[PDB]
mmCIF file of C-alpha atoms in Angstrom:
data_model
loop_
_atom_site.group_PDB
_atom_site.id
_atom_site.type_symbol
_atom_site.label_atom_id
_atom_site.label_comp_id
_atom_site.label_asym_id
_atom_site.label_seq_id
_atom_site.Cartn_x
_atom_site.Cartn_y
_atom_site.Cartn_z
ATOM 1 C CA UNK A 1094 208.974 25.768 235.197
ATOM 2 C CA UNK A 1095 210.107 28.217 232.496
ATOM 3 C CA UNK A 1096 208.995 31.865 232.650
ATOM 4 C CA UNK A 1097 206.817 31.620 229.533
ATOM 5 C CA UNK A 1098 204.756 28.630 230.693
ATOM 6 C CA UNK A 1099 201.545 30.681 231.080
ATOM 7 C CA UNK A 1100 201.903 31.953 227.499
ATOM 8 C CA UNK A 1101 202.723 28.495 226.134
ATOM 9 C CA UNK A 1102 199.641 27.102 227.877
ATOM 10 C CA UNK A 1103 197.521 29.881 226.350
ATOM 11 C CA UNK A 1104 198.970 29.147 222.903
ATOM 12 C CA UNK A 1105 197.969 25.472 223.168
ATOM 13 C CA UNK A 1106 194.396 26.299 224.171
ATOM 14 C CA UNK A 1107 192.994 28.691 221.548
ATOM 15 C CA UNK A 1108 190.100 27.829 219.215
ATOM 16 C CA UNK A 1109 192.207 28.299 216.076
ATOM 17 C CA UNK A 1110 193.515 25.517 213.867
ATOM 18 C CA UNK A 1111 197.073 26.769 214.426
ATOM 19 C CA UNK A 1112 196.679 26.341 218.207
ATOM 20 C CA UNK A 1113 195.390 22.789 217.750
ATOM 21 C CA UNK A 1114 198.223 22.050 215.303
ATOM 22 C CA UNK A 1115 200.796 23.366 217.759
ATOM 23 C CA UNK A 1116 199.322 21.238 220.534
ATOM 24 C CA UNK A 1117 199.187 18.137 218.341
ATOM 25 C CA UNK A 1118 202.914 18.432 217.583
ATOM 26 C CA UNK A 1119 203.653 18.847 221.311
ATOM 27 C CA UNK A 1120 201.447 15.866 222.167
ATOM 28 C CA UNK A 1121 203.553 13.743 219.789
ATOM 29 C CA UNK A 1122 206.746 15.111 221.359
ATOM 30 C CA UNK A 1123 205.751 15.461 225.023
ATOM 31 C CA UNK A 1124 209.307 14.785 226.221
ATOM 32 C CA UNK A 1125 210.547 17.874 224.365
ATOM 33 C CA UNK A 1126 208.236 19.848 226.678
ATOM 34 C CA UNK A 1127 209.376 18.171 229.912
ATOM 35 C CA UNK A 1128 210.734 21.463 231.274
ATOM 36 C CA UNK A 1129 207.161 22.776 231.511
ATOM 37 C CA UNK A 1130 205.882 19.899 233.643
ATOM 38 C CA UNK A 1131 202.470 19.916 231.980
ATOM 39 C CA UNK A 1132 199.808 17.401 233.010
ATOM 40 C CA UNK A 1133 199.585 15.172 229.910
ATOM 41 C CA UNK A 1134 197.021 12.773 231.362
ATOM 42 C CA UNK A 1135 193.759 12.222 229.470
ATOM 43 C CA UNK A 1136 190.785 9.853 229.490
ATOM 44 C CA UNK A 1137 190.191 10.607 225.814
ATOM 45 C CA UNK A 1138 186.411 10.580 225.227
ATOM 46 C CA UNK A 1139 185.573 7.859 227.776
ATOM 47 C CA UNK A 1140 183.738 10.338 230.016
ATOM 48 C CA UNK A 1141 181.865 11.894 227.096
ATOM 49 C CA UNK A 1142 178.318 11.138 225.861
ATOM 50 C CA UNK A 1143 177.572 8.368 223.378
ATOM 51 C CA UNK A 1144 179.100 8.508 219.885
ATOM 52 C CA UNK A 1145 176.797 6.157 217.887
ATOM 53 C CA UNK A 1146 178.409 6.842 214.518
ATOM 54 C CA UNK A 1147 181.950 6.616 215.845
ATOM 55 C CA UNK A 1148 183.405 9.940 214.725
ATOM 56 C CA UNK A 1149 187.130 10.237 215.680
ATOM 57 C CA UNK A 1150 186.937 12.818 218.479
ATOM 58 C CA UNK A 1151 189.640 11.344 220.750
ATOM 59 C CA UNK A 1152 192.194 14.072 219.974
ATOM 60 C CA UNK A 1153 189.545 16.751 220.510
ATOM 61 C CA UNK A 1154 188.852 15.241 223.913
ATOM 62 C CA UNK A 1155 192.574 14.957 224.695
ATOM 63 C CA UNK A 1156 193.251 18.660 224.103
ATOM 64 C CA UNK A 1157 190.170 19.526 226.181
ATOM 65 C CA UNK A 1158 191.535 17.386 229.038
ATOM 66 C CA UNK A 1159 194.870 19.147 228.664
ATOM 67 C CA UNK A 1160 193.227 22.556 228.959
ATOM 68 C CA UNK A 1161 191.072 21.639 231.965
ATOM 69 C CA UNK A 1162 193.779 19.835 233.936
ATOM 70 C CA UNK A 1163 196.512 22.397 233.383
ATOM 71 C CA UNK A 1164 194.374 25.452 234.053
ATOM 72 C CA UNK A 1165 193.093 23.797 237.205
ATOM 73 C CA UNK A 1166 196.736 23.178 238.185
ATOM 74 C CA UNK A 1167 197.465 26.877 237.668
ATOM 75 C CA UNK A 1168 194.483 27.839 239.810
ATOM 76 C CA UNK A 1169 192.848 29.847 237.009
ATOM 77 C CA UNK A 1170 190.191 27.437 235.706
ATOM 78 C CA UNK A 1171 186.912 29.408 235.979
ATOM 79 C CA UNK A 1172 188.124 32.248 233.740
ATOM 80 C CA UNK A 1173 189.430 29.937 231.005
ATOM 81 C CA UNK A 1174 186.733 27.240 231.017
ATOM 82 C CA UNK A 1175 184.679 28.929 228.291
ATOM 83 C CA UNK A 1176 187.501 29.162 225.756
ATOM 84 C CA UNK A 1177 188.595 25.584 226.458
ATOM 85 C CA UNK A 1178 185.039 24.347 225.926
ATOM 86 C CA UNK A 1179 184.800 26.373 222.707
ATOM 87 C CA UNK A 1180 188.150 25.084 221.418
ATOM 88 C CA UNK A 1181 186.856 21.557 222.065
ATOM 89 C CA UNK A 1182 183.772 22.309 219.932
ATOM 90 C CA UNK A 1183 185.918 23.798 217.146
ATOM 91 C CA UNK A 1184 188.242 20.767 217.168
ATOM 92 C CA UNK A 1185 185.259 18.462 216.737
ATOM 93 C CA UNK A 1186 183.757 20.643 213.992
ATOM 94 C CA UNK A 1187 187.047 20.389 212.085
ATOM 95 C CA UNK A 1188 186.581 16.604 212.069
ATOM 96 C CA UNK A 1189 183.053 17.013 210.713
ATOM 97 C CA UNK A 1190 184.103 19.073 207.675
ATOM 98 C CA UNK A 1191 185.487 15.826 206.292
ATOM 99 C CA UNK A 1192 181.943 14.541 205.794
ATOM 100 C CA UNK A 1193 179.060 15.604 203.544
ATOM 101 C CA UNK A 1194 175.298 15.228 203.593
ATOM 102 C CA UNK A 1195 173.663 13.388 206.475
ATOM 103 C CA UNK A 1196 177.021 12.372 207.948
ATOM 104 C CA UNK A 1197 178.109 15.985 208.160
ATOM 105 C CA UNK A 1198 174.879 16.898 209.970
ATOM 106 C CA UNK A 1199 175.124 13.860 212.270
ATOM 107 C CA UNK A 1200 178.752 14.683 213.026
ATOM 108 C CA UNK A 1201 177.945 18.301 213.880
ATOM 109 C CA UNK A 1202 175.040 17.099 216.037
ATOM 110 C CA UNK A 1203 177.315 14.778 218.035
ATOM 111 C CA UNK A 1204 179.888 17.573 218.358
ATOM 112 C CA UNK A 1205 177.172 19.844 219.749
ATOM 113 C CA UNK A 1206 176.053 17.178 222.222
ATOM 114 C CA UNK A 1207 179.605 16.711 223.482
ATOM 115 C CA UNK A 1208 180.051 20.476 223.815
ATOM 116 C CA UNK A 1209 176.757 20.924 225.671
ATOM 117 C CA UNK A 1210 177.675 18.113 228.083
ATOM 118 C CA UNK A 1211 180.681 20.104 229.345
ATOM 119 C CA UNK A 1212 179.027 23.518 228.985
ATOM 120 C CA UNK A 1213 176.434 22.368 231.531
ATOM 121 C CA UNK A 1214 179.052 22.639 234.278
ATOM 122 C CA UNK A 1215 179.480 26.375 233.738
#
């Protein structure tokens, strides 16, 4: 793979909106990133806790899968797990800002539950 793969992987897995935006563009153009041989497989939120109100967290889950799978492939998972989990939480919170009142609180509560369900592993 290219020499800057570790840096590209870091850039796609930060908690910032710009990192998520960069990853989203790559996700839509995976073939353009073929040289990097990233693991683009994801189960979306199928292995996550219940989502009774149906908030659209699929993309949040997808980027979290990307972070986990690729850092595990690089053999440096334990040291990056925290940031990946946090980025996941931030991605979900971004979704929630689109709601007000009860919905906003319910959305943030579901986001917290999802985050805690992965944080339990370490």
